[PDB]
Design an enzyme around this catalytic site. Structure first.
Site, short mmCIF file in Angstrom:
data_model
loop_
_atom_site.label_atom_id
_atom_site.label_comp_id
_atom_site.label_asym_id
_atom_site.label_seq_id
_atom_site.Cartn_x
_atom_site.Cartn_y
_atom_site.Cartn_z
N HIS A 75 57.11 72.52 111.62
CA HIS A 75 58.39 71.91 112.01
C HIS A 75 58.29 71.23 113.40
CE1 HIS A 75 63.09 72.05 111.66
NE2 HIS A 75 62.72 71.09 112.49
N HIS A 128 58.64 68.09 116.15
CA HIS A 128 59.25 66.81 116.50
C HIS A 128 58.32 66.15 117.51
CE1 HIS A 128 63.50 67.45 114.96
NE2 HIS A 128 62.95 68.65 114.83
N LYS A 177 61.19 64.19 105.22
CA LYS A 177 62.27 65.01 105.76
C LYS A 177 63.63 64.53 105.29
CE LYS A 177 64.39 68.15 108.42
NZ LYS A 177 64.16 68.14 109.89
N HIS A 180 67.28 65.08 106.27
CA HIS A 180 68.08 65.61 107.36
C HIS A 180 69.55 65.20 107.26
CE1 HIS A 180 69.35 66.86 111.38
NE2 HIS A 180 68.18 67.46 111.53
N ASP A 189 71.63 64.37 109.50
CA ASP A 189 71.95 63.30 110.45
C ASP A 189 71.66 61.95 109.86
OD1 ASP A 189 72.45 65.46 112.09
OD2 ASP A 189 71.11 64.90 113.73
N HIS A 217 66.85 69.92 105.93
CA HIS A 217 67.86 70.46 106.82
C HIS A 217 69.17 70.03 106.12
CE1 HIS A 217 69.84 70.23 111.12
NE2 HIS A 217 70.77 70.13 110.19
N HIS A 246 64.46 76.04 109.01
CA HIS A 246 65.28 77.05 109.65
C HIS A 246 66.33 77.58 108.70
CE1 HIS A 246 67.69 73.47 109.87
NE2 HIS A 246 66.92 72.94 110.81
N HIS A 262 75.32 68.83 120.19
CA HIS A 262 76.35 68.10 119.41
C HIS A 262 77.43 67.43 120.25
CE1 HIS A 262 75.36 69.38 115.13
NE2 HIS A 262 74.48 70.03 115.87
N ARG A 268 78.40 77.82 113.01
CA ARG A 268 76.96 77.48 112.95
C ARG A 268 76.08 78.59 113.48
NH1 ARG A 268 74.11 72.35 112.76
NH2 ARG A 268 72.45 73.12 114.11
N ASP A 292 60.25 73.88 115.76
CA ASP A 292 61.36 72.94 116.00
C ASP A 292 61.23 72.33 117.39
OD1 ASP A 292 63.50 71.40 115.06
OD2 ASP A 292 64.78 73.11 114.70
#
Ligand code: NI
Ligand code: NI
Ligand code: NI
Ligand code: NI
Lengths: 833, 833
Positions: free
Chosen positions: A404, A406, A487, A489, A491, A516, A542, A590, A606, A630
């Site tokens: 995972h 980035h 991926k 996601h 978003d 995700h 996750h 966020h 969350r 992550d």
């Protein structure tokens, strides 16, 4: 200033001493790293003063920090402190052995020159009551059993000292030692592997000799006895002993026999068992504390034949014609042997030599010289052209695989390899909004560039595209470009339509889909996303959900047979600061407002104690198969390994045993960041475990530091990164010791040692050629038929329910509740910040 | 047999002699090529015999073929025949000078050894009444006007012959020549550039001497007069003449003057004008017949300053310190100079030296050494490091550019360069059904492959994708892959929707769209396709339509301002076999049946005397701008050039003059296969004309062979392909002479000398780097704003109508009719089959 590099580094070392000095004056008990900086710093200043000699500082250094000023583990961790500095007579090395040599130290003198007020003793906390300790079984071992033996009188008739190693062919000794050369024929000293008998001039000694093993062929020394041991070559050796004047007096009476496995036989040599462990590392039955956790690993199997251990050094075993073979076919010499390793792997905790050939693990077993040792197979020869990495007393594990990632900054990479990670999988294009939010390298162009960018780095890499699409068109493109996975996601939108379209694409290209989920339940709740999977393999990131997915019950996925679930590391395990940290981290990521009703609702939906507690347990249950970082998008690259062991340590202490040691738990957990990431992403034939035929991506650990900071990272058979002290110093160990890139990380080497992983389609087009990559490129595969049952030691499939109001998780009927730990191991003892 | 390569070649040479023998026995008058094979063949046999000497065969060779046995051109074409063969005393070279030395030859002896019956004279046709002839203006030229002069007595007091070249610095002569060295200072012989005066020992000659030009700096020879000519360096030269014993007797009385432009001045030297043309090729006012056509090029401008021509050779002008400069900055020496070239190019028919530097045309003008010659600019210096290609007597044109190529086989390619083509534009992937029908390289993969495939071949290449699409999606992709143009072909569908979608793409990517319209009028008649253009630039292939398009009136497109139109070559020009050939060809390509009513109807609607007649005219009108091949898909790669001139020869003869020479027509036509194909495809800054700054893709022609077989092909500054004889021989001219690849065609050189053209989008991605191409890659551009008015010398826009029944074409009210020619030049005289 004309600063040379070494001057720049010492300034840093000094700064670390001074920080340690400031913590000391606050009456803080110092950890290992602090004790070291502080003492090296003072040593350097005392040298600057010009008043003190090396012998002085050797003493003065033991009397700065005392038991009172350090943490409970420090006296065992700090074997010594080394530093070099410029005396009035040039650079000299000062070694301070056992610096905690007393109860009170000498505060004044530990701070002297810092101009910091000297604290009083009562400012320090009171002493509490050993990381990586070896618990030895009680007893002795008889060396070299079942062998012809003889005791011989030996005299040193020379005028200078003569010393003989344990594996030297005794007939081939210095011509000035006088003894019965004919009885010595085919013999060597019956003593612990790698030590020696010293004969001062004129000395008489009575020596236990034992037969050599294996083929019984003598090579080297003086060439007295060249050849296989037989009556015919004995006659020739004696001819040569006479002609060349090698000291010889017949001992007609010499006691002869064998090394029998019974009490009080005068030919046999025994080694105290505690002492065996200290010389060669632990053997079958011994147990090893993992770092400063409560975990113990018990040696399950040992390949060593007691008395023939492969140890390298002056007078030691790995020498020409002894432990180092001479005359086997050159092509089968091991490139490197790792000697006397404790291997911890999902497949077993064992003691073995490891041979490396062509960047690969060639063999695991008893290595050495078949001419002189029993039990050496033809794939484990230490030869002239074999390098030696000494594993005695250390643990080896596979390089960790973080799946995972980035790619936000190149420095994540250095932080990864330095913690023990050798393969990274995820997506990104640098510090953009897209990459900061999602593991996606979206454009084919960027695939090209990330592969080319990371081409010299000594890690294996995979890059994943953006899977969020309700049409396959652009997915085909990003995979053909070289993405080895996609991926999904939220978003970018994780909707049932996108989920479906993306899995249909995975079925065609044999790549993994990492997801995700839709936290907002915008287009469905978790059941709708599960339905959209349509029984197809998918990797859920996750899985607990703090880091993303259906509120509040994404964790349900750990019970779907086609789901391969991972956790990210920051919720691992549930500790006292966990919830507070994560709420704010969510608020920050966020862009939410502490003072707005619904922002705070989203965030409480969350980040949930009830589900994080359940994550500790499902993780112990083998219901969550992988741990990942992550990196910089809610998790921590350098803490994949430590958070795994910290989760294990907490569960050992909270729950039942899992099957007089912690083997079953140790193996379950090591699997979470080695073998299981490789299976999930489809490259498990190449990496992810210590097994023959796979890349020799290998990390050496001190047991006292296991799971926190490793010694050395081997990449494809060559050292890529490692602890390294002062480059100007007389040895590698003097301060400042830090993790630095090694020869495996320079020039073209990183590429020669590693793999870039792409889809088969991209390889079918030879994107390695198109993109000008020097790193080996291979295709991922065997990913569309995986189920939870393919995750080694983590195949549990509980029925999970989650209460939509309480957030309470139930698994197989049992309510999951777990305590909030106040501390974790692998932290305060190890880190300077 | 252990055959060496030379033995294998001569076997072929023999087989050609014997074929020519068979033809002669049938009483056929032989052409050039036949005469040569026959004579070389017999010479080799006479040598095999062992009876005759070299001197004999030199006479015998003249008496084999007589005027009666050969075609009318042959006695002027065959200056001589050379071959080498193994005599009893090893290999010897035989040259037969002027082999047609008589009227009847000797048939028996021309066939002797062939066992072919010897024909009688009356079996041969009766003699008819000069290709590339130079028509000289009547008169003389005074050399070297406007210069100080002197006549001096010179004596050779040495015992061996001394000979002095036209440009040697006279003061620098052999010390055994006695004359007035002080008067000789700064002078050279006033004789034709490149010849010499010979002094036998003891000889006395009265020599005309003229002053050197330019800067007047003396270099080389004996270093007597090193330096710029001035009173101070004169004194030093005299000192060195005395010291070093260079022969000197004062001639107080010598006649002194200058080279005045009047009659009977004793200091001047004139060259007979016919003789000038023969030495240096034609000059301003002279005319040159193109091959054996009726076309005459008149030299419009000459850069030469009479007397200083650049001619290289023993005793000649291009020598150290004379015409070859010594002392200029080394970086500006020309790499190569083409001396005394007639240039025929759309932009002008002229006489000039051509300077090549870095593979580019660096300059055009009067070249040489500024130290000794007037009129030499700094970009025209012949230096030490300058290679010489001697163009005296020859024509230079740009490399032809074929822009309708089907890549059906690699051999098309060799056939193209060997005919004088250096750029190919088209599509294909080899001998597949798609490529045999269309100029399409359809897949991105195939683009990569064809660019990689052709990477070592010394030609510039452009590849075109399949433009037939009603959506832009895949068109984007083929252009990004590297296509530099798209082809719309009916076989893939050329419907108005496809036409629009394709041209909309062309507007985005700046690439040219080539079209072969819907013959079947399935979707629309020509009007409807023209409407679909929507005023956008488009290249119409074989605009006449035999090769494809709207029946029967595609030709109408030659009147649309946004259309750039080309013809393919097989219908050029209308000759007696044209229609019969094409009907069958159509039948064969379309798999049609002569006995089915509608198969024969389609065919008669496609192949049309009226439209092909009209094409001859619009071609001459400048209404069709380009001639191309259609290589192996109705057209002929090696005949783009000959067919252009064949068309021009037939129109000269049928129509009115176009503007006492054929310059206007010559220029109009040469532009059809040079500059206009490069403008239409978007790379005219690189190639397509003999102009400074473009690649030195240059073709050298003998006027007698112009437009049939060239001598030499220069690719980016280096000879790539050329006529070459026996590689074992003492010279390059002995048989068998054939077109062979040269050093520009071997190893890495083809790539270093040429360009691969792609779209800007492909170059933006560096497909040159991705594809691992060694050939230079450049983007095409400036193609979406072209109109017919951008076509050099071919910008006519007639209002065209076509009668749908009679097929009669009307242009600007005039009914277009043209005769069926029975013969064409550039054929029977040149080819062996
Ligand atoms: Ni996530
Ligand atoms: Ni993430
Ligand atoms: Ni066509
Ligand atoms: Ni065609």
């Amino acid at each position: 200033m004309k600063l040379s590099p070494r001057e720049i580094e010492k300034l840093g070392l000094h700064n670390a001493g001074y920080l340690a000095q400031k913590r000391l004056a606050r009456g803080l008990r110092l950890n290992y790293t602090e004790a070291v900086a502080l003492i090296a710093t003072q040593i350097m200043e005392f040298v600057r003063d010009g008043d003190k000699t090396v012998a002085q500082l050797m003493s003065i250094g033991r009397e700065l920090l005392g038991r009172r000023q350090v943490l409970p583990a420090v006296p065992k961790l700090v074997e010594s402190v080394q530093v070099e500095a410029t005396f009035p007579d040039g650079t000299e090395l000062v070694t301070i052995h056992d610096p905690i040599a007393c109860e009170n130290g000498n505060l004044e003198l530990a701070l002297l020159g810092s101009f910091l007020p000297v604290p009083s003793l009562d400012k320090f906390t009171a002493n509490d009551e050993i990381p990586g300790e070896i618990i030895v079984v009680g007893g002795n071992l008889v060396l070299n059993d079942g062998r012809k033996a003889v005791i011989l009188k030996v005299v040193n008739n020379g005028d200078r000292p003569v010393q003989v190693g344990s594996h030297y062919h005794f007939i081939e000794l210095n011509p000035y030692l006088t003894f019965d050369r004919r009885k010595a024929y085919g013999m060597r000293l019956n003593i612990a592997a790698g030590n020696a008998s010293r004969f001062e001039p004129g000395e008489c000694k009575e020596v236990l000799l034992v037969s050599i093993g294996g083929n019984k062929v003598i090579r080297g020394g003086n060439a007295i006895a060249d050849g296989p041991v037989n009556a015919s070559n004995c006659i020739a050796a004696m001819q040569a002993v006479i002609t060349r004047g090698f000291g010889h007096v017949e001992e007609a009476n010499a006691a002869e026999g064998q090394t029998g496995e019974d009490a009080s036989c005068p030919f046999t040599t025994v080694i105290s068992r505690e002492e065996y462990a200290n010389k060669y590392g632990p053997t079958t039955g011994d147990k090893i504390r993992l770092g400063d956790t409560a975990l113990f690993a018990e040696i399950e199997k040992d390949f060593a034949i007691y008395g023939d251990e492969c140890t390298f050094g002056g007078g030691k075993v790995i020498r020409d014609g002894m432990g180092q073979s001479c005359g086997h076919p050159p092509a089968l010499s091991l490139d490197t042997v790792i000697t006397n390793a404790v291997i911890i792997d999902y497949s077993g905790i064992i003691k073995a030599d490891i041979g490396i050939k062509d960047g690969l693990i060639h063999s695991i077993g008893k290595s050495g010289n078949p001419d002189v040792m029993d039990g050496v197979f033809q794939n484990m020869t230490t030869g002239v052209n074999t390098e030696v990495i000494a594993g005695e007393g250390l643990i080896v594990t596979a390089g960790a695989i973080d799946c995972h990632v980035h790619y936000i900054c190149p420095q994540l990479v250095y932080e990864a390899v330095t913690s023990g990670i050798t393969t990274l999988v995820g997506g990104g294009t640098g510090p953009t909004a897209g990459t900061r939010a999602t593991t996606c390298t979206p454009a084919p162009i960027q695939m090209k560039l990330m592969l080319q960018s990371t081409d010299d780095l000594p890690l294996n890499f995979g890059f994943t595209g953006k899977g969020n699409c309700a049409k396959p068109d652009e997915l085909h493109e990003i995979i053909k470009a070289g993405a080895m996975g996609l991926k999904l996601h939220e978003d970018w939108g994780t909707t049932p339509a996108a989920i479906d379209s993306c899995l249909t694409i995975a079925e065609q290209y044999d790549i993994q889909v990492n997801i995700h989920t839709d936290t907002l339940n915008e287009s469905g709740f978790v059941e709708h996303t599960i339905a959209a999977f349509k029984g197809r393999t998918i990797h859920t990131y996750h899985s607990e959900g703090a880091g993303g997915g259906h509120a509040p019950d994404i964790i349900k996925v750990c019970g779907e047979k086609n789901v391969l679930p991972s956790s990210t590391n920051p919720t691992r395990p549930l500790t006292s600061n966990t919830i507070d940290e994560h709420v704010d981290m969510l608020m920050v990521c966020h862009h939410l407002d502490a003072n707005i009703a619904e922002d705070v609702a989203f965030s409480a939906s969350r980040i949930r104690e009830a589900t994080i507690a359940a994550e500790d347990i499902l993780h112990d249950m083998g219901a969550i198969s992988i741990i990942s970082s992550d990196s910089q998008a809610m998790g921590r690259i350098g803490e994949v390994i430590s958070r795994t062991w910290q989760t294990a340590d907490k569960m050992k202490s909270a729950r039942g045993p899992l099957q007089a040691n912690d083997n079953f738990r140790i193996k379950r957990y090591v699997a979470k960041y080695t073998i299981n990431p490789a299976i999930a992403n489809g490259f498990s034939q190449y990496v992810g475990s210590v097994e023959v035929g796979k890349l020799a991506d290998l990390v050496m650990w001190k047991p006292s530091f296991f799971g926190a900071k490793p010694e050395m990272v081997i990449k494809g058979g060559e050292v890529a990164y490692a602890n390294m002290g002062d480059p100007n110093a007389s040895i590698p160990t003097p301060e400042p010791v830090k993790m630095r890139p090694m020869y495996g990380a320079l020039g073209k080497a990183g590429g020669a040692l590693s793999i870039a992983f792409v889809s088969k389609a991209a390889l079918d087009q030879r994107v390695k050629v198109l993109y000008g990559l020097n790193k080996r490129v291979e295709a991922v595969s065997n990913v569309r038929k995986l189920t939870k049952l393919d995750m080694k030691l983590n195949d549990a499939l509980p029925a999970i329910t989650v209460d939509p109001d309480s957030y309470t998780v139930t698994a197989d009927g049992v309510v999951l509740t777990c305590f909030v730990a106040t501390t974790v191991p692998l932290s305060r003892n190890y880190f300077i910040f």
